Structure 1
């Protein structure tokens, strides 16, 4: 049974923009940190490859490009911004990377919490769908069901959706339908929704879900 990720709701609801590969590495960082500290973490190529069913080559490529793409990225807890890394990554040994996560982020990871096993998300491809599945997990019940109403503006400002998704039909076509379909096809969750409106504008989305 796969590693059980837990995280403060403050991270689930933080504002940031990360890719799938970056979020994948971040889950392992959160696991290492939580089992305790100083903030220095490590990643092995071959273990990453085995965890996510990748080749060693493509694992290496994903880690390397994720790592150089962290530079300049920031995290916002609502309203305080932090950088993820305070030193570049570096490799002491072949197939091994050592990273220095901002230790000031530690209390935000481990505190009103969200939890899910890593097997639930490791087949999701779209990072916004990972964000949505995390935000739904935050409200999940022991038995595996839940219901929550999310505001559209808060979704856009938390997941940092691109500007053209401020037009609602593109929001529907390229974000909502795709990420719900991904969740329904790639996780053990079964998800439905309905739109809440005020005048002509749609203001919230109401999600209901159960477990298979």
Structure 2
């Protein structure tokens, strides 16, 4: 049995997406990525791109009060305006219409229809993971890294991944100061590895690769907790 179907996980929603989206350049908050997980699930459960979110189900899934769930949704929704996702040279807006609330506790969004082929009809070159794996992660760049690791994950839960550092900076859109490699180490790399090791079922180590005086790549290795 593959760990995607392990008994403790199987009941959580299966999030699935093309590797082009896993590799795309975009910048979303934790809260925005949490809602996008719910949109992809909904879309795949049956599409014109019009989706829904209930405050009450959001609070239940992420372990929040009703009031904070309402705050998270309202502010993340407004901040979606003007956000674009760039595939690799090809930019699309996430939303083609502002969000609105038809009735108390309910919100309605229109996801760009040109993005729907990135979430359905996948036969290969896709990324998969259970929502329960990511819902305790806090830092949004730790969410980006976890999805990239998942992209090379074998059915048994393990894998290895080399990632060029210039590429990480471009596609995750890290802030300016993380071009200085000691800041990249202390505020992105160590922080995100610690989050994955303590909030997911993945167990992760890494080694730096150098060319001359420059560090150019990180090489990641990992195994699943249910195999240990």
CA distance in 2, matches of 1:167, 1:211: 32
Report the RMSD for the aligned CA atoms in angstroms: 0.6
Deviations 1:61-120 (A, max 9, x none): 000000000011100010200000000000001000000010011112224100000000
Please state how far the C-alpha of 1:35 moved relative to its aligned partner.
Answer: 2.0
**What is the SS of the residue equivalent to 2:102?**
coil
Please state how far the C-alpha of 1:33 moved relative to its aligned partner.
Answer: 1.2
Deviations 1:182-208 (A, max 9, x none): 000100100000000000000000000
Match of 2:177 among 147, 161, 164: 164
**What is the SS of the residue equivalent to 1:92?**
strand
CA distance in 2, matches of 1:180, 1:199: 25
**What is the SS of the residue equivalent to 1:180?**
helix
**Structure 2 unmatched runs, 5+:** 1-10
So what's the TM-score if we normalise by structure 2?
0.92
Residue aligning to 1:207: 220
Residue aligning to 1:155: 168
Correspondence list, 1:20-169, <5 A:
20-111=30-121, 112-169=125-182
So what's the TM-score if we normalise by structure 1?
0.99
CA distance in 2, matches of 1:83, 1:109: 16
Deviations 1:29-78 (A, max 9, x none): 01111222111000000000000000000000000000000011100010
CA distance in 1, matches of 2:190, 2:120: 32
CA distance in 1, matches of 2:205, 2:89: 32
Q: How many residues align?
A: 212
CA distance in 2, matches of 1:168, 1:64: 36
Deviations 1:95-149 (A, max 9, x none): 0000001001111222410000000000000000000000000000000000010
CA distance in 2, matches of 1:203, 1:148: 14
CA distance in 1, matches of 2:46, 2:54: 20
CA distance in 2, matches of 1:35, 1:42: 13
